[PDB]
Amino acid sequence: CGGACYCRIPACIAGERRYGTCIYQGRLWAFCC
Amino acid sequence: CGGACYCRIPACIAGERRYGTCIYQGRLWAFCC
């Protein structure tokens, strides 16, 4: 629980920060932790 | 708990499935959940 990350379009959730980009299912996403 | 996934080189660990790819700090990683 915690210490991990997610992919989100268009942006990360308030409280999180964008650390890079995901490539998933042929779309680009924000990589958020 | 936030995100549940990680970026790993070279591959995911036990208990995980690869969902895509991360672009992080100028390189490519396995996106694992």
Coordinates of all heavy atoms in Angstrom, one line a residue, unseen atoms left out:
Chain A
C1 N 0.9 -1.2 0.0 CA 0.0 0.0 0.0 C 0.9 1.2 0.0 O 1.5 1.5 1.0 CB -0.9 0.0 1.2 SG -1.9 1.6 1.3
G2 N 1.0 1.9 -1.1 CA 1.9 3.1 -1.2 C 3.3 2.8 -1.8 O 3.6 1.6 -2.1
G3 N 4.0 3.9 -2.1 CA 5.3 3.7 -2.7 C 5.3 3.3 -4.2 O 6.4 3.0 -4.7
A4 N 4.2 3.4 -4.8 CA 4.1 2.9 -6.1 C 3.4 4.0 -7.0 O 3.2 5.1 -6.6 CB 3.3 1.6 -6.2
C5 N 3.1 3.6 -8.2 CA 2.8 4.7 -9.2 C 1.6 4.2 -10.1 O 1.1 3.1 -10.0 CB 4.0 4.8 -10.1 SG 5.5 5.3 -9.2
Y6 N 1.2 5.1 -10.9 CA 0.0 4.9 -11.8 C 0.2 5.7 -13.1 O 1.1 6.6 -13.2 CB -1.3 5.3 -11.1
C7 N -0.7 5.4 -14.1 CA -0.7 6.2 -15.4 C -2.0 6.9 -15.4 O -3.1 6.2 -15.2 CB -0.5 5.2 -16.6 SG 1.0 4.3 -16.4
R8 N -2.0 8.1 -15.9 CA -3.2 8.9 -15.9 C -3.3 9.8 -17.1 O -2.2 10.3 -17.4 CB -3.4 9.7 -14.5
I9 N -4.4 10.0 -17.7 CA -4.7 11.0 -18.7 C -5.8 11.9 -18.1 O -6.8 11.5 -17.6 CB -5.2 10.3 -20.0 CG1 -4.0 9.6 -20.7 CG2 -5.7 11.4 -21.0 CD1 -4.5 8.6 -21.8
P10 N -5.5 13.2 -18.1 CA -4.4 14.0 -18.8 C -3.2 14.3 -17.9 O -2.2 14.8 -18.3 CB -5.0 15.3 -19.2 CG -6.0 15.5 -18.1 CD -6.6 14.2 -17.8
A11 N -3.4 14.1 -16.6 CA -2.5 14.7 -15.6 C -2.5 13.9 -14.3 O -3.4 13.1 -14.1 CB -2.9 16.1 -15.3
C12 N -1.5 14.0 -13.4 CA -1.6 13.4 -12.1 C -2.7 13.9 -11.2 O -3.2 15.0 -11.4 CB -0.2 13.4 -11.5 SG 1.1 12.7 -12.5
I13 N -3.0 13.1 -10.2 CA -4.0 13.6 -9.2 C -3.3 14.6 -8.3 O -2.1 14.5 -8.0 CB -4.6 12.3 -8.3 CG1 -5.4 11.4 -9.3 CG2 -5.4 12.7 -7.1 CD1 -6.3 12.1 -10.1
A14 N -4.1 15.7 -7.8 CA -3.5 16.6 -6.8 C -2.9 15.8 -5.7 O -3.5 14.9 -5.2 CB -4.6 17.5 -6.2
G15 N -1.7 16.2 -5.3 CA -0.9 15.5 -4.3 C 0.2 14.6 -4.9 O 1.1 14.3 -4.2
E16 N 0.0 14.2 -6.1 CA 1.0 13.3 -6.8 C 1.9 14.2 -7.6 O 1.7 15.4 -7.8 CB 0.3 12.2 -7.6
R17 N 2.9 13.6 -8.2 CA 3.8 14.3 -9.1 C 4.1 13.5 -10.3 O 4.1 12.2 -10.3 CB 5.2 14.7 -8.4 CG 5.1 15.8 -7.3 CD 4.7 17.2 -7.8 NE 5.7 17.6 -8.8 CZ 7.0 18.0 -8.6 NH1 7.4 18.2 -7.3 NH2 7.8 18.3 -9.6
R18 N 4.3 14.2 -11.4 CA 4.6 13.5 -12.7 C 6.1 13.2 -12.7 O 6.9 14.1 -12.8 CB 4.1 14.3 -13.9 CG 4.3 13.6 -15.2 CD 3.8 14.3 -16.4 NE 4.0 13.4 -17.6 CZ 3.4 13.6 -18.7 NH1 2.5 14.5 -18.9 NH2 3.7 12.8 -19.7
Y19 N 6.4 11.9 -12.8 CA 7.8 11.5 -12.9 C 8.2 11.1 -14.3 O 9.4 11.0 -14.5 CB 8.0 10.3 -11.9 CG 8.1 10.7 -10.5 CD1 7.0 10.9 -9.7 CD2 9.4 10.8 -9.9 CE1 7.1 11.3 -8.4 CE2 9.5 11.2 -8.5 CZ 8.3 11.4 -7.8 OH 8.4 11.8 -6.5
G20 N 7.3 10.9 -15.2 CA 7.7 10.5 -16.6 C 6.4 10.2 -17.4 O 5.4 10.8 -17.1
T21 N 6.5 9.3 -18.3 CA 5.4 9.0 -19.2 C 5.2 7.5 -19.2 O 6.1 6.7 -19.2 CB 5.7 9.5 -20.6 OG1 5.9 10.9 -20.5 CG2 4.7 9.2 -21.6
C22 N 3.9 7.0 -19.3 CA 3.7 5.6 -19.7 C 3.3 5.4 -21.1 O 2.6 6.3 -21.7 CB 2.5 5.1 -18.9 SG 2.4 5.5 -17.2
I23 N 3.7 4.3 -21.7 CA 3.1 3.9 -23.0 C 2.3 2.7 -22.7 O 2.8 1.6 -22.2 CB 4.2 3.5 -24.0 CG1 5.1 4.6 -24.2 CG2 3.6 2.9 -25.3 CD1 6.4 4.3 -25.0
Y24 N 1.0 2.7 -22.9 CA 0.1 1.7 -22.5 C -1.1 1.7 -23.5 O -1.8 2.7 -23.7 CB -0.5 1.9 -21.1 CG -1.7 1.1 -20.7 CD1 -1.4 -0.3 -20.4 CD2 -3.0 1.6 -20.6 CE1 -2.5 -1.1 -20.0 CE2 -4.0 0.7 -20.2 CZ -3.8 -0.6 -19.9 OH -4.8 -1.5 -19.5
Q25 N -1.3 0.5 -24.1 CA -2.4 0.3 -25.1 C -2.4 1.3 -26.2 O -3.4 1.7 -26.6 CB -3.7 0.2 -24.4 CG -3.9 -1.0 -23.5 CD -4.0 -2.3 -24.2 OE1 -4.3 -2.4 -25.4 NE2 -3.7 -3.4 -23.5
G26 N -1.1 1.7 -26.7 CA -1.0 2.5 -27.8 C -1.2 4.0 -27.6 O -1.4 4.7 -28.6
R27 N -1.4 4.4 -26.3 CA -1.6 5.8 -25.9 C -0.5 6.1 -24.9 O 0.2 5.3 -24.3 CB -3.0 5.9 -25.1 CG -4.3 6.1 -26.0 CD -4.7 4.7 -26.6 NE -6.1 4.7 -27.1 CZ -6.8 3.6 -27.3 NH1 -6.2 2.4 -27.1 NH2 -8.0 3.7 -27.8
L28 N -0.2 7.4 -24.8 CA 0.7 8.0 -23.8 C -0.1 8.5 -22.6 O -1.1 9.2 -22.8 CB 1.4 9.2 -24.5 CG 2.3 8.7 -25.6 CD1 2.6 9.8 -26.6 CD2 3.6 8.0 -25.1
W29 N 0.5 8.3 -21.4 CA -0.1 8.7 -20.2 C 1.0 9.4 -19.3 O 2.2 9.1 -19.4 CB -0.6 7.5 -19.4 CG -1.4 6.5 -20.2 CD1 -1.0 5.8 -21.3 CD2 -2.8 6.2 -20.0 NE1 -2.0 5.1 -21.8 CE2 -3.1 5.3 -21.0 CE3 -3.8 6.5 -19.0 CZ2 -4.4 4.7 -21.1 CZ3 -5.0 6.0 -19.2 CH2 -5.4 5.1 -20.2
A30 N 0.5 10.2 -18.3 CA 1.4 10.7 -17.3 C 1.7 9.6 -16.3 O 0.8 8.9 -15.9 CB 0.7 11.8 -16.6
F31 N 3.0 9.4 -16.0 CA 3.4 8.4 -15.0 C 3.5 9.2 -13.7 O 4.3 10.2 -13.6 CB 4.8 7.9 -15.4 CG 5.4 7.0 -14.4 CD1 4.8 5.8 -14.0 CD2 6.7 7.3 -13.8 CE1 5.4 4.9 -13.1 CE2 7.3 6.5 -12.9 CZ 6.6 5.4 -12.5
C32 N 2.7 8.8 -12.7 CA 2.5 9.6 -11.5 C 2.8 8.8 -10.3 O 2.4 7.6 -10.2 CB 1.0 9.9 -11.5 SG 0.4 10.8 -12.9
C33 N 3.5 9.4 -9.3 CA 3.8 8.8 -8.0 C 3.6 9.7 -6.8 O 3.5 9.3 -5.7 CB 5.3 8.2 -8.0 SG 5.8 7.3 -9.5
Chain B
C1 N -4.1 4.2 -1.0 CA -2.8 3.6 -1.3 C -2.1 4.2 -2.5 O -0.9 4.0 -2.7 CB -2.9 2.1 -1.5 SG -3.5 1.3 0.0
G2 N -2.9 5.0 -3.3 CA -2.3 5.5 -4.5 C -2.1 4.5 -5.6 O -2.8 3.4 -5.6
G3 N -1.1 4.7 -6.4 CA -0.7 3.7 -7.4 C -0.2 2.3 -6.9 O 0.2 2.2 -5.7
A4 N -0.4 1.3 -7.7 CA 0.0 -0.1 -7.4 C 1.1 -0.6 -8.3 O 1.5 -1.8 -8.2 CB -1.2 -1.0 -7.4
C5 N 1.6 0.2 -9.2 CA 2.5 -0.3 -10.2 C 3.9 0.3 -10.1 O 4.2 1.3 -9.4 CB 2.0 0.0 -11.6 SG 0.2 -0.6 -11.8
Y6 N 4.9 -0.4 -10.8 CA 6.3 0.1 -10.8 C 6.9 0.0 -12.2 O 6.3 -0.6 -13.1 CB 7.0 -0.9 -9.9 CG 6.5 -1.1 -8.6 CD1 5.6 -2.2 -8.3 CD2 6.8 -0.3 -7.5 CE1 5.1 -2.4 -7.0 CE2 6.3 -0.5 -6.2 CZ 5.4 -1.6 -6.0 OH 4.9 -1.8 -4.7
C7 N 8.0 0.7 -12.3 CA 8.8 0.6 -13.5 C 10.1 -0.1 -13.1 O 10.8 0.2 -12.1 CB 9.3 2.0 -13.9 SG 7.8 3.0 -14.3
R8 N 10.4 -1.2 -13.9 CA 11.5 -2.1 -13.6 C 12.3 -2.3 -14.8 O 11.8 -2.4 -15.9 CB 11.0 -3.4 -13.0 CG 10.1 -3.3 -11.8 CD 10.0 -4.6 -11.1 NE 9.0 -4.6 -10.1 CZ 9.1 -4.2 -8.9 NH1 10.2 -3.6 -8.5 NH2 8.1 -4.3 -8.0
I9 N 13.7 -2.5 -14.6 CA 14.6 -3.0 -15.5 C 15.3 -4.2 -14.9 O 15.8 -4.2 -13.8 CB 15.7 -1.9 -15.9 CG1 15.0 -0.7 -16.7 CG2 16.9 -2.5 -16.5 CD1 15.8 0.6 -16.8
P10 N 15.3 -5.4 -15.7 CA 14.9 -5.5 -17.1 C 13.4 -5.9 -17.3 O 12.9 -5.8 -18.5 CB 15.8 -6.6 -17.6 CG 16.0 -7.5 -16.5 CD 16.0 -6.6 -15.2
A11 N 12.9 -6.4 -16.3 CA 11.6 -7.2 -16.4 C 10.8 -7.0 -15.0 O 11.3 -6.6 -14.0 CB 11.8 -8.6 -16.7
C12 N 9.5 -7.4 -15.0 CA 8.7 -7.4 -13.8 C 9.2 -8.5 -12.9 O 9.9 -9.4 -13.3 CB 7.2 -7.7 -14.2 SG 6.5 -6.4 -15.2
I13 N 8.8 -8.3 -11.6 CA 9.1 -9.3 -10.6 C 7.9 -10.4 -10.5 O 6.9 -10.3 -11.1 CB 9.4 -8.8 -9.2 CG1 8.2 -8.0 -8.6 CG2 10.6 -7.9 -9.3 CD1 8.3 -7.6 -7.0
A14 N 8.1 -11.4 -9.6 CA 7.0 -12.3 -9.3 C 5.8 -11.6 -8.8 O 5.9 -10.7 -7.9 CB 7.5 -13.4 -8.3
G15 N 4.6 -12.0 -9.3 CA 3.3 -11.5 -8.8 C 2.8 -10.3 -9.6 O 1.6 -9.8 -9.4
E16 N 3.6 -10.0 -10.6 CA 3.3 -8.9 -11.5 C 3.1 -9.3 -12.9 O 3.6 -10.4 -13.4 CB 4.4 -7.8 -11.4 CG 4.7 -7.3 -10.0 CD 5.8 -6.3 -9.9 OE1 6.6 -6.2 -10.9 OE2 5.9 -5.5 -8.9
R17 N 2.4 -8.5 -13.6 CA 2.2 -8.6 -15.0 C 2.7 -7.3 -15.6 O 2.5 -6.2 -15.0 CB 0.7 -8.8 -15.3 CG 0.5 -9.0 -16.7 CD 0.6 -10.4 -17.2 NE 0.0 -10.6 -18.5 CZ -1.2 -11.0 -18.8 NH1 -2.1 -11.4 -17.9 NH2 -1.5 -11.1 -20.1
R18 N 3.3 -7.4 -16.8 CA 3.7 -6.2 -17.5 C 2.5 -5.7 -18.3 O 1.8 -6.3 -19.1 CB 4.8 -6.6 -18.5 CG 5.4 -5.3 -19.2 CD 6.7 -5.5 -19.9 NE 7.0 -4.3 -20.6 CZ 8.2 -4.0 -21.1 NH1 9.2 -4.9 -21.1 NH2 8.3 -2.8 -21.7
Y19 N 2.2 -4.4 -18.0 CA 1.1 -3.7 -18.7 C 1.5 -2.7 -19.8 O 0.6 -2.4 -20.7 CB 0.2 -3.0 -17.6 CG -0.6 -4.0 -16.9 CD1 -0.2 -4.6 -15.7 CD2 -1.9 -4.4 -17.4 CE1 -0.9 -5.6 -15.1 CE2 -2.6 -5.4 -16.8 CZ -2.1 -6.0 -15.6 OH -2.9 -6.9 -15.0
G20 N 2.8 -2.4 -19.9 CA 3.3 -1.4 -20.9 C 4.7 -1.1 -20.6 O 5.4 -1.9 -20.1
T21 N 5.0 0.2 -20.9 CA 6.4 0.7 -20.8 C 6.4 2.0 -20.1 O 5.5 2.8 -20.3 CB 7.0 0.8 -22.2 OG1 7.0 -0.6 -22.7 CG2 8.5 1.3 -22.2
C22 N 7.4 2.3 -19.3 CA 7.6 3.6 -18.7 C 8.7 4.3 -19.4 O 9.8 3.6 -19.8 CB 8.1 3.5 -17.3 SG 7.3 2.4 -16.2
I23 N 8.6 5.6 -19.6 CA 9.7 6.4 -20.0 C 10.0 7.3 -18.7 O 9.2 8.1 -18.3 CB 9.2 7.3 -21.1 CG1 8.8 6.5 -22.3 CG2 10.4 8.2 -21.5 CD1 8.0 7.3 -23.4
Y24 N 11.2 7.0 -18.2 CA 11.6 7.6 -16.9 C 13.1 7.9 -17.0 O 13.9 7.0 -17.1 CB 11.2 6.7 -15.7 CG 11.7 7.2 -14.4 CD1 11.2 8.4 -13.8 CD2 12.8 6.6 -13.7 CE1 11.7 8.9 -12.6 CE2 13.3 7.1 -12.5 CZ 12.7 8.2 -12.0 OH 13.2 8.8 -10.8
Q25 N 13.4 9.2 -16.8 CA 14.8 9.6 -16.7 C 15.6 9.2 -17.9 O 16.8 8.8 -17.8 CB 15.5 9.2 -15.4 CG 15.0 10.0 -14.2 CD 15.3 11.4 -14.3 OE1 16.4 11.8 -14.7 NE2 14.4 12.3 -13.9
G26 N 14.9 9.3 -19.1 CA 15.6 9.1 -20.3 C 15.8 7.7 -20.7 O 16.5 7.4 -21.7
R27 N 15.2 6.8 -19.9 CA 15.2 5.4 -20.4 C 13.9 4.7 -20.3 O 12.9 5.3 -19.7 CB 16.2 4.6 -19.9 CG 16.3 4.6 -18.5 CD 17.8 4.7 -18.5 NE 18.2 6.1 -18.0 CZ 19.4 6.4 -17.6 NH1 20.4 5.5 -17.7 NH2 19.7 7.7 -17.2
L28 N 13.9 3.5 -20.8 CA 12.7 2.6 -20.9 C 12.7 1.6 -19.9 O 13.7 0.9 -19.7 CB 12.6 2.0 -22.3 CG 12.5 2.9 -23.5 CD1 12.7 2.1 -24.8 CD2 11.1 3.6 -23.6
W29 N 11.6 1.3 -19.3 CA 11.4 0.4 -18.2 C 10.1 -0.4 -18.5 O 9.2 0.1 -19.2 CB 11.2 1.1 -16.9 CG 12.1 2.2 -16.6 CD1 12.4 3.3 -17.3 CD2 13.1 2.2 -15.4 NE1 13.4 4.1 -16.7 CE2 13.8 3.4 -15.5 CE3 13.3 1.3 -14.4 CZ2 14.8 3.8 -14.6 CZ3 14.3 1.7 -13.4 CH2 15.0 2.9 -13.5
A30 N 10.0 -1.6 -17.9 CA 8.8 -2.4 -17.9 C 7.8 -1.7 -16.9 O 8.2 -1.4 -15.8 CB 9.1 -3.8 -17.5
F31 N 6.6 -1.5 -17.3 CA 5.5 -1.0 -16.4 C 4.8 -2.2 -15.9 O 4.2 -3.0 -16.7 CB 4.6 0.0 -17.2 CG 3.5 0.5 -16.3 CD1 3.8 1.5 -15.4 CD2 2.2 0.1 -16.4 CE1 2.8 2.0 -14.6 CE2 1.2 0.6 -15.6 CZ 1.5 1.6 -14.7
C32 N 4.9 -2.5 -14.6 CA 4.5 -3.7 -13.9 C 3.5 -3.5 -12.8 O 3.7 -2.6 -12.0 CB 5.8 -4.3 -13.3 SG 7.1 -4.6 -14.4
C33 N 2.5 -4.3 -12.8 CA 1.4 -4.3 -11.7 C 1.1 -5.6 -11.2 O 1.1 -6.6 -12.0 CB 0.1 -3.7 -12.2 SG 0.4 -2.1 -13.2

